[PDB]
Write a protein that binds this ligand. Structure first.
Ligand code: X23
Ligand code: X23
Ligand code: ZN
Ligand code: ZN
Lengths: 102, 103
């Protein structure tokens, strides 16, 4: 089965704890709901389930959207957001990609 | 902003299949009824009980739910039966196709 890559971070509780001193403009509660926990090295976060890691968050970027764009394969992402959400993010990026540059 | 069924008489699925008795066309009658449609009599004309959107000339491969969302995305029945994402996907898909098919 598609097993949780970090079982010790499966609980939301364990995840927000890592964001104790969060100086970055991306909301820590959003990140943790989206499966992420902080590493303690800048804004580096990682998904507890797929292990996908992300840094250098721009102030406006969305945790669930980023999760779906970079790591669409995540099972935690699938059972939380569903197929249509995931495919939606990718379609949108392709459309944008294609409209800009004509 | 009231958004109530345009033909409240056709709200029950059972009322809608009943209209398909002599259905002789490519597209599945249960799939049509399920999507909110009922037959009018004339040809392969169907209308959604809720939005009043009407459709004819069904190709054999075409999906009731998809066509409903493509043509009449505003329907409340469609929304609460399939959800925002579904509806917005059909549209995004069509925009991407058209866009790509150019160069
Ligand atoms: C919210 C996403 C942001 N807009 C973005 O695009 N970030 C990128 C990113 O996070 N990564 C891509 C490249 C950098 C990008 C920004 N400069 C590759 C994957 C990720 C990244 O840097 N991930 C790692 C990593 C660091 C060094 C070597 C290999 C992988 C990472 C590891 C652990 C925890 C977090 C991130
Ligand atoms: C799954 C639909 C099929 N692939 C399609 O594209 N059908 C179109 C369609 O149903 N309509 C579009 C144009 C014809 C197309 C068929 N060549 C316009 C809207 C719809 C249509 O014919 N709607 C009406 C209608 C309005 C004015 C005059 C004649 C028909 C309609 C009325 C009653 C019952 C069904 C449809
Ligand atoms: Zn993940
Ligand atoms: Zn409708």
């Amino acid at each position: 089965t598609n097993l949780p890559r970090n079982p010790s971070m499966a609980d939301y509780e364990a995840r927000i704890f890592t964001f104790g001193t969060w100086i970055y403009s991306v909301n820590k509660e959003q990140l943790a709901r989206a499966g992420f926990y902080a590493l303690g090295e800048g804004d580096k976060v990682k998904c507890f389930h797929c292990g996908g890691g992300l840094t250098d968050w721009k102030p406006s970027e969305d945790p669930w959207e980023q999760h779906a764009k970079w790591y669409p394969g995540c099972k935690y992402l699938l059972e939380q957001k569903g197929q249509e959400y995931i495919n939606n993010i990718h379609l949108t990026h392709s459309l944008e990609e294609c409209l800009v540059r004509t």
